[PDB]
């Protein structure tokens, strides 16, 4: 690994600098290096890992969607043949995205998840596993579309069962997991009714727990609850 000669603390410090510089590919490489040191990650370090790869894959997903739309229009009735270039370039971006997803999933499997014993770390990483199988599923079309979808569902479900048992309904990671599982249902699994039911039940149970929170935690939880609300407004 190119980061093997750098101190763990230095990699974390540089990941924070790269975030300030909006250098997210660098940020992801630094946090990959930090994970490969083999020690568990703190709450803040898990968040840095997530921000880095979310931004990297975010740019790739946004590009793939632009290109996939051009490719779809190219295959409409009346569209002039332009040769293989659109498909080629869509495939290049798709392959790069898949490689980033594979890299994240490999970090979770070697060996973040297996060493995650606390509910907050285990749920965070299982959510992440669902998320990156979900991004794979957004672009999947062949023999393994169904297995990729089931891998996402399985990871999210294990994370939900732990979160329900071990975390309060307003816990931000529990809320973000439920949010993202509902997006999985709506956008990936062709189950909009499941998506809506999950989002509503999540929102209502969090609402009833807000009275237990400080002003700062209240703000953190309500911010995420607003995303559940926005989705429900779009979905119904």
């Amino acid at each position: 690994g190119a980061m093997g000669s750098m101190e763990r603390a230095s990699l974390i410090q540089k990941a924070k600098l790269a975030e300030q510089a909006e250098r997210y590919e660098d940020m992801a490489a630094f946090m990959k290096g930090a994970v490969e040191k083999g020690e568990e990650l703190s709450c803040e370090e898990r968040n840095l890992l997530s921000v880095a790869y979310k931004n990297v894959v975010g740019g790739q997903r946004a590009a793939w969607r632009v290109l996939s739309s051009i490719e779809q229009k190219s295959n409409e009735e009346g569209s002039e043949e332009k040769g293989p270039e659109v498909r080629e370039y869509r495939e290049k971006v798709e392959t790069e995205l898949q490689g980033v997803c594979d890299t994240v999933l490999g970090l979770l499997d070697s060996h973040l998840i297996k060493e995650a014993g606390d509910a907050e770390s285990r749920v965070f990483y299982l959510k992440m596993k669902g998320d990156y199988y979900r991004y794979l599923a957004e672009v999947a079309t062949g023999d393994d579309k169904k297995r990729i979808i089931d891998s996402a569902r399985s990871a999210y479900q294990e994370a939900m069962d732990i979160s329900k048992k071990e975390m309060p309904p307003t816990n931000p990671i529990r809320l973000g997991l439920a949010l993202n599982f509902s997006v999985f249902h709506y956008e990936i699994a062709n189950s909009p009714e499941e998506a809506i039911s999950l989002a509503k039940t999540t929102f209502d149970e969090a609402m009833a727990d807000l009275h237990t929170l400080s002003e700062d935690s209240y703000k953190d939880s309500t911010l995420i609850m607003q995303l559940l609300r926005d989705n429900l407004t779009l979905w119904t």
């Binding site: 998320d131 809320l175 949010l179 993202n180 997006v183 956008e187 995420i224 995303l227 779009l234």
Partner: peptide
């Protein structure tokens, strides 16, 4: 257009 965890 669905929103996921930020």
């Amino acid at each position: 257009r669905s929103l996921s965890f930020e």
